[PDB]
Design a protein around this nucleic acid. Structure first.
Lengths: 57, 78
DNA sequence: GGCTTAATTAATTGCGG
DNA sequence: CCGCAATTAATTAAGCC
């Protein structure tokens, strides 16, 4: 029952597209994305964190 | 004010050695209690806080650093 | 109940003060 | 020394199938 973001299919779209460019975007890109898809920076920071973990293994 | 730092790929790979500790709820709840009235700890008083929660110095120092990160990320997360 | 995955935790490296 | 950015390996748990 702890909070848990479900991403729109649009924002999931933009996250995967960005991850495709760099696997380590800088803070400003992250921010710019956040505005562009209505999530806060921290949600994106974690997404990228988790997503990278997936990739590595 | 943004004071950005250095990218991770350029760093030399970590040496995690090692053990994955997890602080007891009393350890935790004391830390949180102190945090509420004091966001920064001078070294001597960090030493005392640790010595009295049977944690190391590094551990309290790191806990404090990680707490502040959470704190700000919460503060300015409106 | 399994499984993927968002969230959380204790750690690290290295600048800039 | 110290904070802090920027990251990880591990985990905890939400909620689809």
């Amino acid at each position: 029952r702890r909070y848990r973001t479900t991403f729109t299919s649009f924002q999931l779209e933009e996250l995967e597209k960005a991850f495709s460019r760099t696997h380590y975007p800088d803070v400003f890109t992250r921010e710019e994305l956040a505005m562009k898809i209505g999530l806060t920076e921290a949600r994106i920071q974690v997404w990228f964190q988790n997503r990278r973990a997936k990739w590595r293994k | 004010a943004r004071r950005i730092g250095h990218p991770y790929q350029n760093r030399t790979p970590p040496k995690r050695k090692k053990p994955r500790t997890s602080f007891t709820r009393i350890q935790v709840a004391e830390l949180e209690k102190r945090f509420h009235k004091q966001k920064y700890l001078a070294s001597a008083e960090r030493a005392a806080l640790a010595r009295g929660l049977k944690m190391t110095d590094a551990q309290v120092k790191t806990w404090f650093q990680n707490r502040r990160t959470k704190w700000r990320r919460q503060t300015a997360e409106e």
